[PDB]
């Protein structure tokens, strides 16, 4: 939770704002998580 | 040995000899050759006694089994096919018995004959099968209309087995009439049938 | 690691055959297909988007005739579909032989469910990792979903595969049990658009149906499917703006 | 028993006589010997009733299966060869039936004739098959036209069978004609055909 | 480790087979079912509420007619249920084939039990992770429960599935052998009602029974079901104040 | 740790099958069962305090009829027990079939031992985790124990199940060979009461016995049990005191 | 994937079966083979190139006659392919036996998929580690691809093997449906030229085809080959100047 | 890599099978066998060199007769050879049985690689791990290498065994398609001498040959090897001065 709030804080900074909005948090949940375990792969071929 | 079947408007009526004779030998004077297959299905067998019973039991077992698996009442058309399939597959154990399956179902009324050599044919609203059949077809057809009630049908049914019995020296005086009226499944049994033919005197 | 997904015979501590929820995931990754049950009939819509245009644009098939009154559509391995459908089509034809009766959607469902449960129970042979949709009209419209483990679940409307999740929420709101044939069809086509995140084209959908009054299976032809699509694209676009 | 066939330029018309007679013994009221294999395919049997009924159901069921498979209706030839192989497999069950399998496909109109030792053979003319066949050929062959419709084939198919009936006491009465106009599978049924033979006698 | 649990051919060091011990909990993962016995017959109640709007309100079923005078419930895998009850039904009808006699309530559950015992000893196959409750009247009512091992226990009121813990505590106080058919039926509905934490609706639960007068299986339409559900629901409201 | 308890095909270098010794410990998690042999009959006493109040009085009920002079109790998997007890009935009636001789107990136990050794030798399957007490009067009263392994042992008092260790010690003191039917029957009841740590009543045992003179299985009735219970409780009370 | 790739009985947590995905990689070990369908016939070009000049270039060949109007090419094991295609001759012949009909290319593809699928299910056996190109004319041109799983994909310009990646790229850009038999012939020689990344000569490559006007299989003699390659060479040089 | 060489059923991640590659390593491990084809025949030479002078000079044997004009010679496990060539002989006779025709080197090669592949497919059997160079005259001389994989390849001239690479690099330079019969067998003695790196005597090589002009398999004696043996030696000495 500390990492979400710091990371959300990174979006707010970029966009030049003091306040953290709703969009920034959900963006931080997506950001942090994505870089830790992956999403691509795969569709058939043979699994279709 | 002979068996009859006719389609009533409000029912279906079929009949069996309840005493079967061959030579001077009588096996039983309470021998079943009339089979209750399900609640409003019946089977009447002409041909051999023993093979009748043995085949006939398995067909009961099927009626239940199918009804449970389908969540519905079985059809006549299912079981009509089935007997014949069983009979063709076990021609190493052949059952040399001539069946008549008929009755009432969701599909409606119809009477199928199954040959002792397999195969399921449909008869329009009359059927006879056996030794006494040749005469019997005409006996029924005299008073057969499609709007004949159940009561007149049973009268009518007796007269065909009655026809056979005098010609041959080796038929029974026992008789069972089966009524299938979709409200009862009544088995008239020798006594009740007897007095129908005591109008016919003998 | 686990050793409970080594084989089917091994349950996890969780009281789960871990290897059959993994056969389940096999369905999800493949392309989507939707059955939509109304009282005026049943509708079956299934993928043809697959590949590019180096493939036939009339690549075959997701919409298998099983009988002339029963159809099925699939997700999962279409290897496992090819054999499973061969067995299904034969299983149905056996019923017609030995009873001279069309088999009922539900009774068919039990027999293929029993077939899948044979490989599920045995350890020396892997289960199927394919789901089956069986939609027909036997004498009322009926729709089942057959699970990879041989389980039977009856649906009001269902989809399976990739787009399942999008459909679940969409139909949760709009679908009614009292829909028209026209309505239900157009709507499942709206739903099929959302599933693949694009407009339809009749070359990217194969569509079949079994009607109540016809009692027959018929596959809707690409340009006879085109006016339906044409009224469906409006809605799909409306919902992809947002 | 006797069945007749002729190959028309607009379909295939084949005809059968129901009722199977030993000499004066019949086994039932009527007896199916006309099978609808598909909306363009027919099977007309002369032989035993039971053996034909057994095999016919089978044939129907694998016809449907092959349709789905090729997505492409079975040929007259394919049914004929299927049938030869089914009869030789089951040559350990005593089935003696002579078959006429016919219809319409993409290669034309044809009938292929089957004997119960195997065999399917091309006829694109006249084919007749049974115990009444020799007399039957007298009628058919002369009055053959290969410019004959399916509508003049029915007038002829009656006359051939009618003549066979009057030269065998092992044929019954129950004449059905089947006609395959390439748009349907029409069965005239007993009644209508009876009237065509009334104007071929008194 | 521990287990000694990757096969059934290996006993764990505790004298158990973990494989069978995980399969007994696979019942608890499954849907609840409730059995209750009285002396005017034995009522068997099964939860037909599974899914929500996406699934049909009639999902099959879960309370199968096994014989004419015998029914059984299922809990555990839907998939395993499908095959077990096919065999069970075959065996019940096979007894009449060879004897022409009603199969005993006690003996039919035994021969269901033997099939799974088979699957406990051969390693090539897993045991079924399913429990049937076997309810009927042979000529006095009898209630049994079948276990994933092939273990057989005579019950007089029981729960299985989700409701396993709940209903036992509930029946400690409530249950008695002089309840009437009606008081017992109603007591069965409350007991499922604690299991799920909710008031019941006769439209999403299926109830069957074999009474003693009839000795024939019957099934309760949702229309007949209404008054019972009504009497049941008052007590369920009383539960869910705590 | 070792592959030696991980297969049933592998002897340890200790020259022991640990799988068979964990099948061994499958018996001990079954409820107690005791056998007493007297010169006047042979007596099998078995728990029926098993289960809750939601469980029948006559709930297993271990002392199944095998023949017309042969009963057998069990401890272990109640599943695996039913098949061995069933196989015991067939083997006995086979003896009756092929010779027309009353089933020698000794030979029946031998024939169960060979049947159980098919499952011990083979590794694709597993040997039953049940100990049976084979007892009956063929010509003189006899009592044996047949093991999970399928090994023949002669006993004249023994116990099997969780009560075992207590009862071995009790008979090492008490058991005698100058022993009368009533005394025996009292004595073994004494022993059962130590096992359950609590007083007996005729509703928490079943006792079967096979007389010499009669040469038949008979179950003792609860009313008939009662005097034997009363006499036995005197010693139970003394020995559960210090 | 790490322990879920040691057999074929496994499904992985991805929903993929990694043992089947490793079999697909077996195909890319071998060389490219390419098929084209145009409206006048279907075209099969096999690589026949030798890896040493001590071989004879007539056994690394891919083209096999299967019926008088169905040929097919291969990539994968050589070993597996020869058995796979001796089966496909027998299946095709077996259809002629019972129907008197040469096998539709669509039906033949469906049969041999179903054969390959049984080698995937069994854990006693590995799949066929091959993909095929089945090219035929039934009445009108057809071209289908088998995957090593036994799945079926209809194609219309296609390849398998190593050079597959480049041939896909090639037909993405170049291939249109307005091409003649000659014009499609040249494009498949150009697609083979891209993938080996050098100029061809007609002794390292073999062409078979099926036309619709002749409705037969023919094999292009080396004599008839030179002009197609001579045109191709003109265009293969241009891609070696990119 | 481990676990992709612990089974024959396990395809590796690369598409290679390291088991089968290790069976080819088995073929290189053994003794050498060289096959040479010319237009007048195909001459097959095999190492007859022994470990000791305690072994009988001819060790049974290095060149089998399979048909009347078909021989093969061996490299790899000599164990596997016994059964594999036995099987090969029965097959060459079977074709004479059922067509009354001598089998062709394609079709004998074909049977034997199909038979190989079947035991590569199964995981319950391991394949033969020996390679034979089958030589014979059909309409023309033919020389085939049957690989332990189950692959056939036709050669102009070839080698297998430990000396394989040495004799492939040699024939690349020397081999031409003009070589005489006598100069062919000599050229294969030169090859043979290179592999072992020792000079030849007729007591450490075995030559048979297949003549077109006789159309029969013949076995060359040591006596009738002697001129060829000296001639080849002059050249063998020169290669070991290089």
* 8 Å CB contact between E68 and E214: no
Chain centroid to CA F198: 20
Q: Which residues contact C24 (CB under 8 A, 6 or more apart)?
A: C129, C147, C148, C149, G15
Separation between Cα atoms, residue H19 and residue H3, nearest integer Å: 10
Rg (CA), chain E: 18
- Is C122 within 8 Å of E123 when comparing Cβ atoms? no
Find where tokens 């389908």 sit.
B70
Distance from CA of A43 to the nearest CA of C (A): 6
Q: Is C24 left (phi over 0), alpha (psi -120 to 50) or beta?
A: alpha
Nearest-CA residue of chain C relative to B89?
Answer: C98
Helix D76-89 × helix D49-70 angle, to 10°? 130
Q: Is F219 left (phi over 0), alpha (psi -120 to 50) or beta?
A: beta
For residue G185, what are its two tokens? 């012939």
Interface check D62 vs C, CB under 8 A: yes
Structure determined via:
cryo-EM
> Hey, which residues does G157 pair with through a beta bridge?
G36
- Is D49 within 8 Å of B91 when comparing Cβ atoms? no
Separation between Cα atoms, residue G82 and residue G65, nearest integer Å: 11
Helix (H) or strand (E) holding D84: helix D76-89
Kindly list the residues from chain E whose CB atom is less than 8 angstroms away from the CB atom of residue C152: 60, 78, 82
For residue B152, what are its two tokens? 């007149």
Q: Is E34 left (phi over 0), alpha (psi -120 to 50) or beta?
A: beta
For residue B157, what are its two tokens? 């049914």
Chain centroid to CA G23: 16
Q: Is H194 left (phi over 0), alpha (psi -120 to 50) or beta?
A: alpha
For residue A12, what are its two tokens? 């707010």
For residue G49, what are its two tokens? 């190139």
Residue B160's φ and ψ, nearest 5 degrees, are -65, -45
Chains F and G touch (3+ CB pairs under 8 A): no
Nearest-CA residue of chain E relative to F53?
Answer: E172
Helix (H) or strand (E) holding G153: strand G152-154
Chains B and C touch (3+ CB pairs under 8 A): yes
Q: Which residues contact D108 (CB under 8 A, 6 or more apart)?
A: D124
Interface check C29 vs G, CB under 8 A: yes
Query: Which DSSP category does E127 fall into?
Result: P
| Chains in contact with D, counting 3 or more C-beta pairs less than 8 Å apart as contact | B, C, G
Q: What is the 3-state secondary structure (H, E, C) of C42-56?
A: EEEEEECCCCCCCEC
Distance from CA of E31 to the nearest CA of F (A): 21
Count structural domains, chain D: 1
- Is G151 within 8 Å of A42 when comparing Cβ atoms? no
- Is G124 within 8 Å of H123 when comparing Cβ atoms? yes
Separation between Cα atoms, residue G209 and residue G224, nearest integer Å: 13
Separation between Cα atoms, residue C99 and residue B77, nearest integer Å: 7
Chains C and E touch (3+ CB pairs under 8 A): yes
Q: Cβ of D92: how many Cβ atoms within 10 Å?
A: 9
For residue G146, what are its two tokens? 């088998």
Residue G90's φ and ψ, nearest 5 degrees, are -65, -45
3-state percent helix, strand, coil for chain C, nearest multiple of 5: 40, 25, 40
Distance between terminal CA atoms of chain C? 42
Nearest-CA residue of chain G relative to C2?
Answer: G3
3-state percent helix, strand, coil for chain B, nearest multiple of 5: 35, 30, 35
Burial class of residue C174 (count of CB atoms within 10 Å of its CB; 0-12, 13-18, 19+): exposed
CA dist C30 to B117, C46, E192, Å? 52, 11, 39
Find where tokens 């406990």 sit.
E120
How would you label C15-49 residue by residue, b for 16+ Cβ within 10 Å and e otherwise?
A: bbbbbbbbbbbbbbbbbbbbbbbbebbbbbbbbbb
Kindly list the residues from chain E whose CB atom is less than 8 angstroms away from the CB atom of residue B58: 97
Q: Which residues contact C174 (CB under 8 A, 6 or more apart)?
A: C187
Q: Within C45-198, where are the H helices? A: 78-99, 105-121, 164-174, 181-196
Residues 110 through 139 of chain C touching chain B, CB cutoff 8 Å = 110
* 8 Å CB contact between H184 and H18: no
> Hey, which residues does C135 pair with through a beta bridge?
C71, C143
How, if at all, do strands H216-219 and F217-219 pair? unpaired
How would you label D17-31 residue by residue, b for 16+ Cβ within 10 Å and e otherwise?
A: bbbbbeeeebbbbbb
How, if at all, do strands H141-146 and H152-154 pair? antiparallel
Interface check A48 vs C, CB under 8 A: yes
Q: Within H39-175, where are the H helices? A: 78-98, 105-121, 164-174
Q: Cβ of H220: how many Cβ atoms within 10 Å?
A: 18
* 8 Å CB contact between H206 and H60: no
Residues 124 through 183 of chain E touching chain C, CB cutoff 8 Å = 124-126, 128-129
For residue G5, what are its two tokens? 């790739």
Interface check E54 vs B, CB under 8 A: no
- Is C30 within 8 Å of A43 when comparing Cβ atoms? yes
Nearest-CA residue of chain E relative to B55?
Answer: E97
Helix (H) or strand (E) holding H188: helix H181-196
Q: Give the sheet arrangement for strand B12-17, strand by strand.
A: B126-130, B2-7, B12-17, B175-180, B185-187
Tell me which of D54, D58, D92, D189 to substitute to probe the interface with B (most B C-beta atoms closer than 10 Å). Answer: D54
User: What SS3 class is residue G53?
Assistant: coil
Interface check C19 vs G, CB under 8 A: yes
Distance from CA of A41 to the nearest CA of C (A): 9
Rg (CA), chain C: 18
> Hey, which residues does B76 pair with through a beta bridge?
none
- Is H114 within 8 Å of G83 when comparing Cβ atoms? yes
Kindly list the residues from chain C whose CB atom is less than 8 angstroms away from the CB atom of residue A44: 29-30, 77-78
Q: Count B/C contacts: CB-CB distance under 8 Å.
A: 25
Separation between Cα atoms, residue D105 and residue D110, nearest integer Å: 8
Q: What does the angle CA C83 – CA C86 – CA C91 come to, to the nearest 5 degrees?
A: 125
Instruction: Look up the CATH number of the domain holding residue D162.
Output: 3.60.20.10
Residues 83 through 142 of chain B touching chain E, CB cutoff 8 Å = none
Q: Within chain B, where are the H helices? A: 50-70, 76-89, 133-141, 150-167, 189-194
- Strand stretches in chain E, DSSP E: 33-37, 41-47, 63-65, 70-76, 130-137, 141-146, 152-155, 157-160, 205-211, 217-220
User: What SS3 class is residue B57?
Assistant: helix
Find where tokens 């109540």 sit.
C212
- Strand stretches in chain D, DSSP E: 2-7, 12-17, 34-38, 41-47, 97-105, 108-115, 118-123, 126-130, 175-180, 186-187
User: What SS3 class is residue G2?
Assistant: coil
Separation between Cα atoms, residue H61 and residue C160, nearest integer Å: 65
- Is H155 within 8 Å of G55 when comparing Cβ atoms? yes
- Is E93 within 8 Å of B65 when comparing Cβ atoms? yes
- Is A46 within 8 Å of G15 when comparing Cβ atoms? no
**Of H53, H70, H52, H71, which is closest to residue H61 (Cα–Cα)?**
H71
* 8 Å CB contact between C144 and C105: yes
Separation between Cα atoms, residue H219 and residue H81, nearest integer Å: 19
* 8 Å CB contact between F47 and F32: yes
Separation between Cα atoms, residue B40 and residue B179, nearest integer Å: 9
Find where tokens 């059984």 sit.
E72
Find where tokens 């052949």 sit.
B94
User: What SS3 class is residue H163?
Assistant: coil
User: What SS3 class is residue F114?
Assistant: helix
Tell me which of H7, H17, H37, H117 to substitute to probe the interface with G (most G C-beta atoms closer than 10 Å). Answer: H117
**Residues G164, G168, G171, G173: is their CA dihedral positive or negative?**
negative
Separation between Cα atoms, residue F102 and residue F216, nearest integer Å: 11
Chain centroid to CA C60: 15
Q: Cβ of G44: how many Cβ atoms within 10 Å?
A: 28
Q: HSE on the CB side for H108, CA within 13 Å?
A: 38
Interface check C240 vs G, CB under 8 A: no
Residues of B classed as catalytic: 1
Chain centroid to CA E29: 14
Nearest-CA residue of chain A relative to G150?
Answer: A46
Separation between Cα atoms, residue C87 and residue C93, nearest integer Å: 10
Q: Which residue in D24, D28, D52 is closest to B123 by CB distance?
A: D28
Range of the domain at B28: 1-202
Q: What does the angle CA E83 – CA E87 – CA E89 come to, to the nearest 5 degrees?
A: 115
Query: Which DSSP category does C60 fall into?
Result: -
Distance from CA of E88 to the nearest CA of F (A): 17
Q: Which residue in B61, B68, B69 is closest to E97 by CB distance?
A: B61
- Resolution of this PDB entry, in A? 6.9
Distance from CA of B117 to the nearest CA of D (A): 6
> Hey, which residues does H71 pair with through a beta bridge?
H65, H135
For residue C208, what are its two tokens? 């079949």
- Is C104 within 8 Å of B70 when comparing Cβ atoms? yes
* 8 Å CB contact between H208 and H135: no
Burial class of residue B201 (count of CB atoms within 10 Å of its CB; 0-12, 13-18, 19+): exposed
* 8 Å CB contact between E148 and E131: yes
Helix B76-89 × helix B50-70 angle, to 10°? 130
- Is C97 within 8 Å of D57 when comparing Cβ atoms? yes
Residues 66 through 105 of chain C touching chain D, CB cutoff 8 Å = 66-68, 89-90, 93-94, 96-97, 100
Q: Which residue in E23, E58, E83 is closest to C114 by CB distance?
A: E83
- Is G55 within 8 Å of H153 when comparing Cβ atoms? yes
**Of B196, B186, B190, B198, which is closest to residue B18 (Cα–Cα)?**
B190
* 8 Å CB contact between F189 and F230: no
User: What SS3 class is residue C106?
Assistant: helix
* 8 Å CB contact between E233 and E199: yes
Interface check D176 vs B, CB under 8 A: no
């Amino acid at each position: 939770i500390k990492a979400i709030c710091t990371e959300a804080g990174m979006f707010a900074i970029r966009e030049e704002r003091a306040k953290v909005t709703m969009l920034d948090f959900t963006k931080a949940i997506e950001k942090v998580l994505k870089k830790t375990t992956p999403i691509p792969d795969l569709k058939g071929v043979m699994f279709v | 040995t002979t068996t009859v079947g006719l389609v009533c408007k409000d029912g279906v009526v079929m009949a069996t000899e309840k005493r079967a004779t061959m030579g001077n030998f009588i096996a039983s004077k309470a021998a079943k050759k009339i089979y209750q297959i399900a609640d409003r299905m019946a089977m009447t067998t002409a041909g051999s006694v023993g093979d009748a019973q043995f085949l006939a039991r398995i067909i009961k077992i099927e009626a239940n089994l199918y009804e449970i698996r389908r969540e519905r009442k079985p059809t006549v058309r299912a079981i009509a096919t089935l007997t014949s399939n069983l009979l063709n597959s076990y021609r190493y154990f052949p059952y040399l018995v001539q069946l008549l399956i008929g009755g009432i179902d969701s599909e409606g009324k119809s009477i199928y004959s199954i040959d002792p050599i397999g195969g399921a044919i449909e008869e329009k609203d009359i059927v006879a099968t056996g030794s006494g059949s040749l005469t019997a077809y005409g006996v029924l057809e005299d008073r057969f209309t499609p709007e004949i009630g159940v009561d007149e049908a049973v009268e009518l049914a007796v007269r065909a087995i009655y026809s056979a019995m005098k010609r041959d020296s080796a038929s029974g005086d026992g008789i069972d009439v089966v009524k299938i009226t979709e409200d009862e499944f009544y088995q008239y049994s020798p006594e009740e049938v007897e007095q129908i033919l005591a109008k016919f005197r003998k | 690691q686990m050793g409970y997904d080594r084989a089917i015979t091994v349950f996890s501590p969780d009281g789960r055959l871990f290897q059959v929820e993994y056969a389940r995931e096999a369905v999800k990754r493949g392309a989507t297909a939707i059955g939509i049950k109304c009282k005026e009939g049943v509708i079956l819509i299934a993928d043809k988007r697959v590949g590019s245009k180096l493939l036939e644009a009339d690549t075959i098939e997701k919409i298998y005739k099983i009988d002339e009154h029963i159809c099925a559509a699939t997700s999962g391995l279409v290897a496992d579909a090819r054999v499973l459908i061969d067995r299904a089509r034969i299983e149905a034809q056996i019923n017609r032989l030995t009873y001279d009766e069309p088999i009922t959607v539900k009774e068919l469902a039990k027999k293929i469910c029993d077939f899948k449960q044979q490989y599920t129970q045995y350890g020396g042979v892997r289960p199927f990792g394919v789901s089956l949709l069986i939609a027909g009209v036997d004498e009322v419209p009926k729709l089942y979903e057959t699970d990879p483990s041989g389980a039977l679940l009856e649906y009001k409307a269902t989809a399976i595969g990739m787009g399942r999740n999008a459909v679940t929420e969409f139909f949760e709101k709009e679908y009614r049990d009292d829909l028209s044939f026209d309505d239900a069809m157009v709507l499942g086509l709206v739903a099929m658009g959302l599933s693949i995140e694009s407009e339809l084209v009749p070359e990217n959908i194969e569509v079949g149906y079994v009607k109540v009054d016809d009692r027959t299976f018929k596959e809707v032809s690409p340009e006879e499917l085109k006016p339906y699509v044409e009224r469906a694209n409006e809605r799909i676009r409306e919902l992809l703006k947002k």
